[PDB]
Subunit: 442 residues, 4 copies
Amino acid sequence: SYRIEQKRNINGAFPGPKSQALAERRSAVVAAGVASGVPVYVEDADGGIIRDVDGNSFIDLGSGIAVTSVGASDPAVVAAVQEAAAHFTHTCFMVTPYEGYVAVTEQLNRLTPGDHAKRTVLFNSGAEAVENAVKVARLATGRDAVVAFDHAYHGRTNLTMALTAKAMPYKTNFGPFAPEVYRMPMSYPFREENPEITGAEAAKRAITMIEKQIGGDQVAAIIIEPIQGEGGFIVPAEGFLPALSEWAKEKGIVFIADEVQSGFCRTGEWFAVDHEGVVPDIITMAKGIAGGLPLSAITGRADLLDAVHPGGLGGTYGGNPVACAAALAAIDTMEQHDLNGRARHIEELALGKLRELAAELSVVGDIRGRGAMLAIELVQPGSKEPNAELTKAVAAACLKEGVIILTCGTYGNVIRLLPPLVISDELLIDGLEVLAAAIKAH
Amino acid sequence: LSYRIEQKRNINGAFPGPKSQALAERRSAVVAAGVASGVPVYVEDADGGIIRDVDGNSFIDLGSGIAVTSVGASDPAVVAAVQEAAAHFTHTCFMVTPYEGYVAVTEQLNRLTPGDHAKRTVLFNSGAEAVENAVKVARLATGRDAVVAFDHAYHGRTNLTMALTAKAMPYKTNFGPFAPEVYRMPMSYPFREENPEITGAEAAKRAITMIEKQIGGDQVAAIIIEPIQGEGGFIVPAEGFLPALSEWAKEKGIVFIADEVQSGFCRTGEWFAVDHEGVVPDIITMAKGIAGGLPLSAITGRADLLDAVHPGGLGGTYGGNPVACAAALAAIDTMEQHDLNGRARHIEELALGKLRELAAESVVGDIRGRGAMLAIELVQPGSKEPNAELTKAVAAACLKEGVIILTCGTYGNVIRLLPPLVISDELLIDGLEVLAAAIKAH
Amino acid sequence: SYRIEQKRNINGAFPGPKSQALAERRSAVVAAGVASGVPVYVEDADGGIIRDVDGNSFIDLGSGIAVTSVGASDPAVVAAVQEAAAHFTHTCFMVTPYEGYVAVTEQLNRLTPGDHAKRTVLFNSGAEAVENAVKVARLATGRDAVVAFDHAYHGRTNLTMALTAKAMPYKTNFGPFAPEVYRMPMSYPFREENPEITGAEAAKRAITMIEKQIGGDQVAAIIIEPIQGEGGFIVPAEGFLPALSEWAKEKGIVFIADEVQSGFCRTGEWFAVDHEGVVPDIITMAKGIAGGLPLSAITGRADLLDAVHPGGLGGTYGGNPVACAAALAAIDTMEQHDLNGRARHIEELALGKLRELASVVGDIRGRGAMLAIELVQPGSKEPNAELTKAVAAACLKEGVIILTCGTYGNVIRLLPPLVISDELLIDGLEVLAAAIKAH
Amino acid sequence: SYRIEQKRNINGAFPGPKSQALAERRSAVVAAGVASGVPVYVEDADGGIIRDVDGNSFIDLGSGIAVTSVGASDPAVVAAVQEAAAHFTHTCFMVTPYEGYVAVTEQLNRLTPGDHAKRTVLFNSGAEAVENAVKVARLATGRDAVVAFDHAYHGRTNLTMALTAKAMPYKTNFGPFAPEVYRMPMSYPFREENPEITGAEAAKRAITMIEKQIGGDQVAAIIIEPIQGEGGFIVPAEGFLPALSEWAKEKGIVFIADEVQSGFCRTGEWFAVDHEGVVPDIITMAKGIAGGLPLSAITGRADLLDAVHPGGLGGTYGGNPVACAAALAAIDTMEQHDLNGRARHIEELALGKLRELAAELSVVGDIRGRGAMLAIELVQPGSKEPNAELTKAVAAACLKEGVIILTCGTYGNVIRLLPPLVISDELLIDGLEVLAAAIKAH
Ligand SMILES: *Cc1c(COP(=O)(O)O)cnc(C)c1O
Ligand SMILES: *Cc1c(COP(=O)(O)O)cnc(C)c1O
Ligand SMILES: *Cc1c(COP(=O)(O)O)cnc(C)c1O
Ligand SMILES: *Cc1c(COP(=O)(O)O)cnc(C)c1O
């Protein structure tokens, strides 16, 4: 059940007058480099719809980059936020604590993988979460080196930029970057030089390289996204992640799962790592956790997190009570409405339609992902060469028909589906039809 | 002025009470042990100058969540704005689908920050993100690497902001290695200058020569300084220091960054601490008080600098969250409607009056600050040696009587007053009386 | 014509009494970690022979890690050093200059690739050369990033460690390392995941990765050894080095050829890059340059090197006059006796015998007097470090000092002095062949 | 007893024809930035004379920046080099070892301070020596941070540049620099803001700062020159350090004495540290060690150096046998001719003449140093402001009269005397007379 009409409706040209008026105001005061993928301005966002200030209704297939999984205005989230703000907006947990922080903390302990003792700390952004996961690995192990992977993305702070692989736009001219970060090869099936390579073998390749170029006993942490987001929704070959996990344990290296984008039901399991039963030492969370409010978290082994000295990890706003209220409600919605199930259903529907399209066409190089985190990598006809032009064009074409869809990828040639999990089959199918028509059209 | 909950200090028997204890017991199973709180009671409602715990005790709030809830922890306007905004949409990510709130907050910061030159703004979540982004801009726009920070600086808990931060315990220990090309220079700290007669101008010349000799003016991307150093101990530089640095920075093409995360938005009796001396920073970093307790941060600076950054270079998922933006617009509005600059100046007159009365009856080394950002540095009797023991003891003694007061300082020996600006004279005086009694008692 | 008898001769067991006496002294005073590959102590070294203090004569197939290419006591070098030391040992070129520095500088300008305007600065070690090449690239381009490759080795200072790939023993526990160094995939034919990959294709793989992970316009320098030394005498596929060079020029990136080990006739050309006609923007030199004396150099484009401010590049000892005298003589010997030719001849002989030896032999590669055999496990490509250690020991036992190397510790390398006789080289190769068969 | 006539003798204008011919050759082939302080080219250098290719004889008051302490062609050194080179030039100690290395190693063990177990490794340059000291400290302690001081100079590699304080010309545009280097205040009596400050107090200032900004238990090494060379022959106040040494021992910090310039009799003791009886954990050596040949060394505690793994420390050329021969002879000369005594005698003579000059004048700010490492810091008349113009001019004036004298200093205003220790009283006095005349003249 939804608040605004759940269907695609574009009345004439856009941006309309009220959107244009905002754009004109914007350019006087927001940095020129801060661009938006969409030229219309939101007034209301709900279910699978973004409704602009000129009354146009777009299908939302991005969920704010995997954030509003429960929907951009889930009643429970809205109510919780409204109620919490009336009591106190902020007291800073490090100064005067409050139940909401503890309570979110309890849920994450429960929902994250593994049955060992775990603890949590809360912050605001994904980047802060990753920063803190690395702080903990480094202090707990007494080591320096952190290994990250090709096609990784972990944020826009200096260290998270360091950890991030792609330079444009995330890194160019922003260095020099945090030291002792090393990059290793990813398991990226569609582009392996030897297509027959196994997950285990891909892991062994990474492991040998780490051992030879750093040494296992010198690495504080291995950080990897179980499904690489901005890198192009790269899913590693079966057996890769477990091999890295096993080896990390052998060598006393903290294995950090970055589930900022893949976490909270997005992939059809609570965490992406659940697909293969990998149990990370620390896991970083944000985006979907708090139904749109700014919250992030690390949850990991008690012995690691409890190693940090008093006052070592923190922040002013972190674990904001209004955001915490949002999170508790968001997680509750995830359970009450079985969003894991909705995500699995979305996979079945969307991959169905996409494979139909593959069978008609060829520009469709690879279809991959899980749950509500799906992607199609577009290539040049009859080869594997990347096709960024087609990708840019298809996104624009979709936008023209009233479908907001996101792109990504190291080579700028991956269309990604990140719909809110509460999206109706009707709307999703409509969106997928527009997408399929766009690809055919170009 | 008028409030929601009774504005009186009221402690019913021993605390933490039962409901607080229950929360502490829950907390220790799930929150990392290093995340400590200064206060053992759990908030239920925070309003005006009072923190009311879950067991019905009412403490005087002389910390405002570390300078965050300047307008109060539940300002009706803020609360209303948050409630209203959340009902429309919690998040769409400005970089994907933009929205008025972002632009509007951006318009206000342009207007309220110093200088009449062309300015632009980008929004993020935390103070650390803000400082990170200022440095990104300075580095890209100047084409240089080096950033100078000062003794007693504090700028955050990410890797770079830790690098910029001076004090190692607890902010840095075992969390490195730290981001490169950060250089540290001597601060103007009157009370501890080896030559007590030194002038602000002379202190600036000392810093400038050192920068020139050890980096070179044309090699420095940015000088970053807090006009009043917060965690460092509410250090106010001698008159003439900040302008000298500013003038020189302009000479050498160096971006002068004012970190006003803690001192900004009326805290000091002016909109920004730099306004006391009429310094006009090239970029200024903001958070804490900006959004009445919601998680928001900002950089506002010269258009030519910020606009230099390439499309997509600066950003974040949550940044400039719409619910937070609503909160900021309301918070800023309250600051104007109720003349919080005036309230801050009044707080100064009152608080410095009572503190100087106490000095006049020695363990009180220095009284300093301005507006609602005031401090007393405690020393050993009859010398200038730091007295952390007395500082810890006074904070504890205050808490016991129902007054939550914060401490700070490089040497752990500074009591700081950061009351909310909406505090009543009655409550402030009560708090100051408790403070004065506590110092005398120990 | 040689000074000491050019015959392999081991009298009984070693280390002998005088060597043992030195080892006993050594352990009281030299750091324990500083180990030597050979347990005997040199008294005289000449031609292809190392003669120890107990009168044993070993065949020298390492030339001090590619240093004594002209021989460990070339008469010309010896005479020049003796003469120069009598006038002055040192005045520091940055204070009071002298002809020797300028002269060495003239020769390097002449002998290095390319006809464009070039300039030179001198230092002491290979690591100092590389450090200075990077300083110049960074200042001239105004950029930060430097790319190095898998299997690279460039030295033991903090930055050169950073540039170096292998952690044991060069890096472990010695960091944190100099920032803004990025590592890219090498063209290593024998271990390519796709054995059919081309040099051009391997270069494209590296280039795309650089572009995507740094950006061409952000890179101050690409640094590569034309033949990777300590990494295992890895020779890249034809077309790789020129592609990188072309691209570097396109993007304003300084292309640094690290020829510290491969330079000065070692590969049968003056510089390894000459095999493919690549013309580096800066080239780093040491080892062979001064016939054993401590000297190093960078030689590169005038417009790059001249960009550095007065006093920016230097050092106290750098371009030492005694070492310069040695270099001029060494280079002279290289020409007078056509050591390039001797090197090409050593290749023909050595590669001949090594190919006859062919299973435990994975790959035979190299050029001139810089040759190698990579040993694997029988019937696979898995590395065989055990066999490699054992063969080196077996050769030592028979009076042949031979060096090993490689990322996986499984490469036997031939680095004989270029003045070695065919008789001695064949003898050494026979001992090597016998040792491999033996294990 | 000497080889060439020990008298100052300039025949007409210079550079003469043969020098000019070399300059013309030079400019075609040496980088333009590589400048020389002296426009004439050496043919022979012996005793206290540099004789150029046009037959002019200059007094040498620089000894090649403190290198040719035994003289630029000491017969013993010359003979030893000649003999050694005939046997073998190089075999690489790590491959085939040799007596010369071991022997030099024995002497350094014997001559360095302390009676504890010591070990040595050899390299080529001073920078390599410092690099290796730091490698050992870092591995042996398991820590990262290295503290260096204001006015320090340690070399021109990336890390030694990092350690070095002054940017022009050593650092400008050559970064980014090696991470985890921290800079602390030096004891520099002449420029202390509080002139009455004590060495012990100065050390306490540095120590507190280290403790507060890094933490004692986080520092791998403290590296300091007992007399700072290029920084301006700064001698710390008595008691400085010993206090640093005592504290380093308490905190498990490796204390590195950089004696590359001050070592081997230069100050009138074998090492500058011997003046105050400080016993460093590692000591770095080069310059004077091998009478002009390229050699350097670290000598330190067995337990520290032996901690390094096999193959960890090394180099190709390091401990070159011809250089080793030189060193043994050079050390032998130092003993046979009591160069410590000669240095002490030089001090008495030179400081005598310099203080006479101070009495006549005022432009002479400070006279300091020990042994044959002496300096006069020149200031503006009647103040402490630096006088780089006078300094440049005096050096030029001296050169004109046939005296080659070096300058140095953070502020470019220090004339330094680094004569070879084998210089005759007659020549030294002549040189000092020219110097005194030059200062008076300008
Ligand atoms: C979005 C993202 C981040 C950074 O999160 P922010 O909240 O934008 O700081 C980090 N890691 C991954 C894997 C992400 O997808
Ligand atoms: C609190 C503080 C910061 C960091 O802000 P967070 O939001 O706590 O990351 C930065 N700068 C100053 C001056 C501060 O007081
Ligand atoms: C040996 C080596 C160096 C280091 O030279 P040193 O003089 O030992 O510092 C640098 N680069 C390469 C390619 C080498 O083989
Ligand atoms: C000259 C100097 C060095 C550097 O030695 P080089 O051989 O020139 O690398 C190091 N330390 C000190 C104290 C010096 O004066």
